[PDB]
Amino acid sequence: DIYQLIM
Amino acid sequence: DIYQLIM
Amino acid sequence: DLSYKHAILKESQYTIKRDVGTTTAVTPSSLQQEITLLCGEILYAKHADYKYAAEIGIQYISTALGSERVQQILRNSGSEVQVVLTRTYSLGKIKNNKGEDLQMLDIHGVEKSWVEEIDKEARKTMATLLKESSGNIPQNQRPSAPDTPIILLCVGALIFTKLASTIEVGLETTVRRANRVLSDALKRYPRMDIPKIARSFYDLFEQKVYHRSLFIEYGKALGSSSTGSKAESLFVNIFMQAYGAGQTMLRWGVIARSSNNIMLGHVSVQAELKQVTEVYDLVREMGPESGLLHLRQSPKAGLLSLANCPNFASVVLGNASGLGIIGMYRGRVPNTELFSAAESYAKSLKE
Amino acid sequence: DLSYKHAILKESQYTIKRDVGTTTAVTPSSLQQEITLLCGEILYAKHADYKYAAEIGIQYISTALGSERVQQILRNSGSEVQVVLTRTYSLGKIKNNKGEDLQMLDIHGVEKSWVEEIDKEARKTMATLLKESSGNIPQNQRPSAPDTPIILLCVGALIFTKLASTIEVGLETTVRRANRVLSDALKRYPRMDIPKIARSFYDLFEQKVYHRSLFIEYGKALGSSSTGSKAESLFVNIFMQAYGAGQTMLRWGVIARSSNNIMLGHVSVQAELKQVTEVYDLVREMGPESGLLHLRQSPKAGLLSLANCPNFASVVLGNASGLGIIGMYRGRVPNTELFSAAESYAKSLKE
Amino acid sequence: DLSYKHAILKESQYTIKRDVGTTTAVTPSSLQQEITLLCGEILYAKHADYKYAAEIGIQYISTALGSERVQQILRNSGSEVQVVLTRTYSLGKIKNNKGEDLQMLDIHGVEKSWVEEIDKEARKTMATLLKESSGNIPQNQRPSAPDTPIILLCVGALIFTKLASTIEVGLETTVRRANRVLSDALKRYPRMDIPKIARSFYDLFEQKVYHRSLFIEYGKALGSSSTGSKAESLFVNIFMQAYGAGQTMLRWGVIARSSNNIMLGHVSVQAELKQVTEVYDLVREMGPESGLLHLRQSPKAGLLSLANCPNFASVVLGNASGLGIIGMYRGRVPNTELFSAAESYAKSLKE
Amino acid sequence: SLFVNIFMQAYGAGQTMLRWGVIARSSNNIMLGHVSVQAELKQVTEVYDLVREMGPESGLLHLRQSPKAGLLSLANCPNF
RNA sequence: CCCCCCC
RNA sequence: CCCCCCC
RNA sequence: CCCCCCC
RNA sequence: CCCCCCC
């Protein structure tokens, strides 16, 4: 679940 | 093995 | 003779060609958002390697100026480097929150593995931070903040101010001044490694001298804008602080004249004021671009040297030392007696 | 009379033809990389023979300027030398690391055996160094460094500064000044034979006078560039240090005027200030190219001679001696009494 | 001598016959609608092959001028090409929306399979677009728009402006200028492959030189019309931008005269102003058709060459370089010294 | 009379740079004497000569939407 | 050779 | 004849 | 490509 | 041989 962070 | 030196 | 030397060097009908077979990377302005994120992901995580941070800052400069305009700038600096264009590539099977393929930047000369590891470490760091606290991350603490490229470039500008110094003094100065000047950024981003980013920028300014020109153009392009952010005003402030770099003896001689040091009237200095005046006349002839001569690393720099007037140099250094502004300046003092007398008079005047 | 002599020599409708049947070598700019390697292989090995090192430096100058532009330069210097073009030839059955035939430069007038022995000795030296230490050779200690031709040409420029002197004084000065100025290079390349390279450059500047012009053009082409390396800035600095070569009495007379030597007012000198002023007027008329007259070995040089004003020359030499700047200058002092009085006054003024 | 050469070439009683056994295709004006659709179907789909797009543009030119008038034009250009007439043929069992047989164009020299694949790909693309959005396709985004042939011909005119250049420079210029000039079309038709259409037009202008004449007539016929569309005004604007192609040294010499370059007064140029004036007199004698000499690829072109006046050419190129308008022009500079002096004066004047 | 007044107000439509250049000449702007503009006054004069050659119908070129309009463009003289 | 401080 | 030091 | 204000 | 930029 690491590549869908909002940033 | 003298003529393939990187230089 | 000095005007004649300047007319010799300036009035040349032949240009010099360098870097003919080489290439360099730029990013089209339409990818500014995509570069901004990257410029913010070097900031909020602790990375094992900071090799290409300066390159990412230059990529942001390219997006802010334009790829074709950056190619024109690098050509006008006197380099034949062939601009290469940044390409967005899909990572692979990985998908983003929007349901599309995760597109990442592909910069020439930067291994994609470095970009992947920077992005992965930044994502892991933010995942950990959100695990610690929920909903506690505002926009200003996120990598996607529009000013993160400007923060990176402000660290770069701090290392730029000390480009006539050595690497150690420049790094120490950059860290010391960044602890104060970039304090809001260091509060927003508590884990940006300023020493490593500064070393990266020093490296970039060593190998790619033409990028110095690019850097300068950014400052010129940034101080000409009607508006801007606070970080951009900070960048321009440091960029002006870099102005007379490599020519502190001219400024200190103007000070020694404004300080009315009586030892300027010593006959040994009086025999040299004519060539001193010629040096300042050369500065006036060169004009506003004379301050950037050492920053650009122009071969023409060194015509602005007062090293052939040893007694004036000694008196100027002594006046600066008496006022207490000499600091740890390492310029050589040829005449020790003139230095001592000038320093005594300047101390007496200041007290 | 001096203006009349200058107008006689300058206003000539007929050019002079020399070197009609001769040829010289150049290298096309596209072989710059290939010449760079060679300019770095004379640097990091100890060679029995350094005959053609100056020729390799001129070959790099040719690649930096262009073969056709170098032919134009040599024509404009007043020489009919026929440029010949460097050709890459395969060594033979020997193959490189990439699986292709090892291509080596073929320069006109340079025996191929010399190039083979330079390359073989350099390869043997690097093989020994890697046998001693593994992975301890960075880029800056390799012959393929882009600035190695500039290092060779900086040794050449050091010998160029002393072209109005003798061979012994020039060699001693070049070695002494290269131990300091080219110190980073001497750390990177601990076994470049500066005396032998300097003797090679002195030879080249003796037989091929037109190459002096080529050398000068390089400096002109190099100080006009927007950017450059540190080695190129060093080259231009030494090249400017070569400027007023062969005319130190004019500079020392300007000093003696700036020193306010009272013996300039002696009636014997006063009877000569008119012709002294004519000599300086001739310098002003010639302009920026007057400083290169002795470096170019122009026949017109010698109009700038103050040798027909013996008392002014004696007073100038005495003023220089009193200030302590005369050094070991071997100019003749016609009037000994004026010399002694001028030296006494200059010492009194300096103290 | 130049007037005599022009009178030799012009006053010839015998015409030359070429392309005697060959044929070319035209379309009767009554099929303009049917060609318009095709000129719009190369525009709004992504095609694997763009070989005959320039031919379809020429077919539209034929419909706009008339098949018999186009035959007369091709005869007057000096070619014996036998015009062939486009024929509408039924596709087969396929029927259109009106209940009639779907009639498609049959152009000579164009494989029918190419037309079928262009039409099928365009129909598939529009079917997909209407599947994505319903009722969102206005007239201006449809292939049947009356100006789509003009858009195709504007890409052709962009490649026409660079017909005295090389294929690479012409293609780069066409793409770069079409991104800006044909921006409304690129918004209406987001998937027209400008590089491939431009390469098709360059090809057509290479094999079928007489079509250049046809192209020119279209411009002549289009700028003489009382009214027109915006796309037609754009076509005429680019067509005028193509005017003095292949003769930029004449324009730049007129500039150097208007720039009052003092180096025009150098005696070497002064010895050539008489033949320069003869060249401009030849331009005046030829009249308005002298600008199209290189576009038409007239053998008579080359009488307008200033290549026998090397010093005037050098001064003109130097003046252009000083003003900064020389760009990347690759004309050769015979006299380097005149070039340098002219460039220095022009830079001084511009500053 | 009102219709004709507005119709004359429509006259030089699409060519306001020519009118404004005539103004800048009547305004005696010293920057017209800058060398970059001086290098272009010859083509500027050619544009105005073209207006004189076309005559009274040159003002209606853009109103009529004549393809010939655009020859009256000063867009190739950027400094002027 | 140049350069070298501080903000 | 000229030139000749130091950086 | 051109054009673009106001009356 | 010519030609070669930009819009």
Numbering used by the authors:
A (entry chain V), B (entry chain U): 450 to 456
C (entry chain K), D (entry chain J), E (entry chain A): 10 to 360
F (entry chain B): 242 to 321
Q: Mind quoting what the paper says about this structure?
A:
The viral genome is encapsidated in a sheath of oligomerized copies of the nucleoprotein N, forming a ribonucleoprotein complex termed nucleocapsid.
Cryo-EM analysis of the N-RNA/P complex revealed the presence of the same classes of assemblies as was the case with the apo sample. In the case of the spiral particle, we restricted ourselves to rigid-body placement of N-RNA/P protomers due to mediocre map quality, as before with N-RNA. This may facilitate accessibility to P-binding, even in light of the conformational heterogeneity of the nucleocapsid.
